[PDB]
Each structure stands twice: as C-alpha cells, then as structure tokens.
Amino acid sequence: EEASSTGRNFNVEKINGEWHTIILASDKREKIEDNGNFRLFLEQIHVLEKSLVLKFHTVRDEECSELSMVADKTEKAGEYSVTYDGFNTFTIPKTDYDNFLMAHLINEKDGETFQLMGLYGREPDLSSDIKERFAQLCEEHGILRENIIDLSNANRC
Template identity: 50%
Template structure:
C-alpha cells in the first residue's frame, strides 16, 4: 500500500488494467452531477514507455456515451498533468494497486480552479474502510458531503434510457410485413451485440496529450 507521497514514476505499471469508478467528490458540484464533465466512468489505465499514463474512460453527454482516452505526463515535481476540460494536475493520494486507487486532482480553467477526489477500484465496489480513506481526503479539501456521488449503482456503459427506445419495434409494422423464408446458414452464428444492427452502437471518441 502506498501513502500520500507515492509517485507513479517507478510503479505505475502496477496500476495497469481495468478499473471501476466508485466515488467522486468535487468542490464544484455540477462537475460530478449527471452529464458533468468530471462524472467519469473509468475503464482502463495503461503505463506508457515515456513514464506517462493513459486513461480510458467514458462520460455521459446528451444521454449518450462519449469515449475518452487521455495521456497524463509526469512533471518534475512528481505530479501528473493532463488536458481535459481545462488543465489538470493530480497525484495518487493512496492506493493498493490490486484493490483501489484514490486520486487528488486540481482543475484549472478560465482563471478558476476546483478540487476533485476520485476513488477507483478493481471491483465494482469496495469496503467501508477504503471509502473512509476517500472521505479523509474529501474532508481535507473541505468538499461538502453533498458534493460527493457514489457511482457503484450507476448504469455507465449504455444508459437504459438510451438503449430501451432503440429496441422498441412497432408490432403493427411487423404484422404488415411478409416473413421471408429463413436463409440456410452454416458455422457459428451465436447471438451477440455485434451481429444485431439494432444493438450496434458507435460512440465518438476524444483524445488528449500534452
């Protein structure tokens, strides 16, 4: 386990792999509310050869998923710096790379700044003991408890309000159409999202690198 002075310089590879967003808290509440730019659903972290770290995540905007991939560069002070909705500097406050990671971030944009505390985990949820570590940093920054969101129960990848209308096919339309004879198929045609045009989704991607 690593403490507040931990730097990702030599051990960032231990953070590689899949992650889930557990909790977020911001001194600017709207940033972590629904469709806020910092309401980030973390997916993957990747250590890069130049001591940078790649983050793959998605947000929800206009009821649609938006994929993001950003690269954070380590600075001379040991902090990491990345461009996303402004300029961001962050450190790793505490972590057990096999279980959780708590990030301490400051955003700078248009002459203003705000703090963000983020708790990510390898599993969809964590113990109360780990959540208490998150609370420690939130309180240190003076972020009100009402500015905290718990995303353990959130629908992240495809919101139901987006998916359900896509699957609604009018019954009357189907009744009027003639049913053609099924084609003769061979091979493995197991059902899956990739084989169904109505379930196929395309999300715009963004990337950032300093």
C-alpha cells in the same frame, strides 16, 4: 501495502490495468453532477514510460461515449498533467494497487480552479470501509461529504 504516487516507494506499474469509477467528489459539485464534464467513468489505465493513457466513458441520456486521454509526468514525481476542459494536474495520495486508487486533481480553467477527488476500484464497487477512508481523505482536503457522489450504481454501460 499502500503507497502514494509522491512517495519514494511508489511503483507506478502496479496501477496498470482495469479500474472503475466508484466515487467522485469536488468542491464545485456541478462538475461531477449529471451533465458535468468531470463525471467520467474510468475503464483502464495503461502505464507507459513517462505517461498514463486513461480510458473513460461519459454518459448522456443513457448513452455511453468513449474518451481517451494521455497524462504526462510533470517535474514533480508522482504528479501528472493532462489537458481536458482546462489544465489539470493530479496525484494519487493513496492506493493499495489491488483494490483501490484514490486520486486528487486540480483543474484550472478560465482563470479559476477547483479540486476533484476520485475513488477507483479494481472491481465495479468497493467495501464500505474503503469508501469511508475516501470520505476521510476528502475531508482532509476541505470537500464536504455532501459533495461526494457514489456512482457505483451507475458505472456500467
């Protein structure tokens, strides 16, 4: 079964655990390109009472650096906020818990904004059919495929 974090049947405990960044997408492509601050490789999600602890690593000159963030529940069910290179809010429009997790994030920095979408997998890659479903979700949010970057061949340290 599939769910959305904003849906009535969402079970947040089921997204706990191992995840990997498979694809990132954005309407400001520079944010997820090689030296972008949002080209983050997720490692795990730790579900707590009213927050999610997110563990990531970044890459620079073939060198991995760890980073943890705490995302807090907001007043809207299924939405979380976190401070990182500006103010971010995100939701999980679609997940099947056991294979994939699709997230939609809004960043706000210096009075501007951009959208980021991420496809995360329980393993270090996902099927091409799930990747296509993600491209369709990106299209529904006005993000062109040329702004979708598959990072499955670069998500391990």
